[PDB]
Design an enzyme around this catalytic site. Structure first.
Site, PDB file in Angstrom:
ATOM      1  N   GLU A 240       0.784  -1.234   0.000  1.00 47.35           N
ATOM      2  CA  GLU A 240       0.000   0.000   0.000  1.00 47.35           C
ATOM      3  C   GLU A 240       0.829   1.306   0.000  1.00 47.35           C
ATOM      4  O   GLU A 240       0.816   2.057   0.979  1.00 47.35           O
ATOM      5  CB  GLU A 240      -1.026  -0.028   1.130  1.00 47.35           C
ATOM      6  CG  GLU A 240      -1.723  -1.370   1.206  1.00 47.35           C
ATOM      7  CD  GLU A 240      -2.896  -1.417   2.165  1.00 47.35           C
ATOM      8  OE1 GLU A 240      -2.859  -0.743   3.211  1.00 47.35           O
ATOM      9  OE2 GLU A 240      -3.878  -2.148   1.878  1.00 47.35           O
TER      10      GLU A 240
ATOM     11  N   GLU B  60      -4.119  -9.169  -1.083  1.00 49.30           N
ATOM     12  CA  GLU B  60      -4.524  -8.999   0.286  1.00 49.30           C
ATOM     13  C   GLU B  60      -6.011  -8.702   0.408  1.00 49.30           C
ATOM     14  O   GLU B  60      -6.516  -7.745  -0.165  1.00 49.30           O
ATOM     15  CB  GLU B  60      -3.716  -7.878   0.950  1.00 49.30           C
ATOM     16  CG  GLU B  60      -3.764  -7.910   2.467  1.00 49.30           C
ATOM     17  CD  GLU B  60      -3.175  -6.670   3.091  1.00 49.30           C
ATOM     18  OE1 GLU B  60      -1.926  -6.467   3.053  1.00 49.30           O
ATOM     19  OE2 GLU B  60      -3.979  -5.906   3.654  1.00 49.30           O
TER      20      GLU B  60
END
Ligand code: NAG
EC number: 3.2.1.45
Length: 497
Positions: free
Chosen positions: A235, A340
């Protein structure tokens, strides 16, 4: 072979209870003749991947919804399914007695289980760690002479990954992702918060960060573990947010583009690990197609990028067509991969809800959606958590398909576990998504794929309260007559030859 021993904790369905001497499991797979299908069923009412068989007939007795396989309409091939060996998962698993550990590892990786073939591995600490650390914390060590693996790797993660591969049905692919660099490489000098790398792509900071990726791979390689792939950063958008709480490292799409082109790409290619795939993004799909446009339209970056890794936090809603669909249209030769997923951060909701059927349905609905928009794999977050959603050094906010209760040497397999297994068990690497046509508007979610050997696998999810009578037609075989009960998920398998 061994059935679910159910237990309610007050939510909509049961968990299955395992311990040192007992866990629910499957027999080896058996290959029924042409004209017979296999059905695996799970229900909110309590059935858990229960097997039955029936006929595929020449005559059609259903008059409701029909789903017709179109094997000639060919889409993406499947990489696989798995979850993350975080510090938290390793800690929880290693908190059970050895026989219980093995039953947990078999549940995920074994043919007696649901056949995982992907493990995501954090490169040092994240929120799901019991401390902040990196592999090179000794400051201003630009040649990374003090780079080393801590106990978390050498004592917790690594031995558990060896054991998982030993148990594994299929070859397992390892994926690595960093959360933070050494803070002495960061604009903000901190493990978390708004901070990116210091300086400019090409400089000594950017070159040291990339050397770290190679140092990591070298160390696992010493431990006889090789990676299928790495992500460019976990991220990257998070580390551009002022006061972001967990370990992060900020990259704008442009910064990632140049970092890959100037530093990570070349460094990887010049190393003995040049075969490891590199995936970009590793972040919410909401950042697509933009992030893809920025990185992949620079030939200098694109040559090093094998695929685009995506996350979704499921308590939300980001449209698949505009993001995944459109990204595929613009770059049809760069694979999409879900790296994820997790659920449960609704502040008004428990981080762990033992027996939540909803969280299960959320898993399978997402996987179906992913598979319908060209995604080649789906990776869960933490493989296991304790009953509070932990340990997490910042704050517990998410659930996990396996919840470990160490004071009782027991672990609970959540509906999420079985919603995942309806896919992972029955969709081996190299399976290809194929056409499946609905004869009329309906309330189900379904996806068809073809195994490498040519056999058919169809998953049908009913997130409604009402039973849905259903026919599945295979042109080469005939009509499979069934019912998709309210709040159920089915996986059908059949020989086509
Ligand atoms: C697992 O262990 C418990 C208590 O230690 C044992 O009594 C039980 O039979 C096992 N689980 C089940 C219900 O099979």
């Amino acid at each position: 072979a061994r059935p679910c021993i159910p237990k309610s904790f007050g939510y909509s369905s049961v968990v299955c209870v395992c311990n040192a001497t007992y866990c629910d499991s499957f027999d080896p797979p058996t290959f029924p003749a042409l004209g017979t299908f296999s059905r695996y069923e799970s229900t909110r009412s309590g059935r858990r991947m229960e097997l039955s068989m029936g006929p595929i007939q020449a005559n059609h007795t259903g008059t409701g919804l029909l789903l017709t396989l179109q094997p000639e309409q060919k889409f993406q091939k499947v990489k696989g399914f798995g979850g993350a060996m975080t510090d938290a998962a390793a800690l929880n698993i290693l908190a059970l007695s050895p026989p219980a550990q093995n039953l947990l590892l078999k549940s995920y990786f074994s043919e007696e289980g649901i056949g995982y073939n992907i493990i995501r591995v954090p490169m040092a600490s994240c929120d799901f760690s019991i401390r902040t650390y990196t592999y090179a914390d000794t400051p201003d060590d630009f040649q990374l002479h003090n780079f080393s693996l801590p106990e978390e790797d050498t004592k917790l993660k690594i031995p558990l990954i060896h054991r998982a591969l030993q148990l594994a049905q299929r070859p397992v692919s390892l994926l690595a992702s960093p959360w933070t660099s050494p803070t002495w490489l960061k604009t903000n000098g901190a493990v978390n918060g708004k901070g990116s790398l210091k300086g400019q792509p090409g400089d000594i900071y950017h070159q040291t960060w990339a050397r770290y990726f190679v140092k990591f791979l070298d160390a696992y390689a010493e431990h006889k573990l090789q990676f299928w792939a790495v992500t460019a950063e976990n991220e990257p958008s998070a580390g551009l947010l002022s006061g972001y709480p967990f370990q992060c490292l900020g990259f704008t799409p442009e910064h990632q583009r140049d970092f890959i082109a100037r530093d990570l790409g070349p460094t990887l290619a010049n190393s003995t690990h040049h075969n490891v795939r590199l995936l970009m993004l590793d972040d919410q799909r909401l950042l697509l197609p933009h992030w893809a446009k920025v990185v992949l339209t620079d030939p200098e970056a694109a040559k090093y990028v094998h695929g685009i890794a995506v996350h979704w936090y499921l308590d939300f809603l980001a449209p698949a067509k505009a993001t995944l669909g459109e990204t595929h249209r613009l770059f049809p030769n760069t694979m999409l991969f879900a790296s994820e997923a997790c659920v449960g951060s609704k502040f008004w909701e428990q981080s762990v809800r033992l027996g939540s059927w909803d969280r299960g349905m959320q898993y399978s609905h997402s996987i179906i959606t992913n598979l319908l928009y060209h995604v080649v794999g789906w990776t869960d977050w933490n493989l296991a958590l304790n009953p509070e959603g932990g340990p997490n050094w910042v704050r517990n906010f998410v659930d996990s398909p396996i919840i470990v209760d160490i004071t009782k040497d027991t672990f609970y397999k959540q509906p999420m576990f079985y919603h995942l297994g309806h896919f992972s068990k029955f969709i081996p690497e190299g399976s290809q998504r194929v056409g499946l046509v609905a004869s009329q508007k309906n309330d189900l979610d379904a996806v068809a794929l073809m195994h490498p050997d040519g056999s058919a696998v169809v998953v049908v999810l009913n997130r409604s309260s009402k039973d849905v009578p259903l026919t599945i037609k295979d042109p080469a075989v005939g009509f499979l007559e069934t019912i998709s009960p309210g709040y159920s998920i089915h996986t059908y398998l059949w020989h086509r030859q």
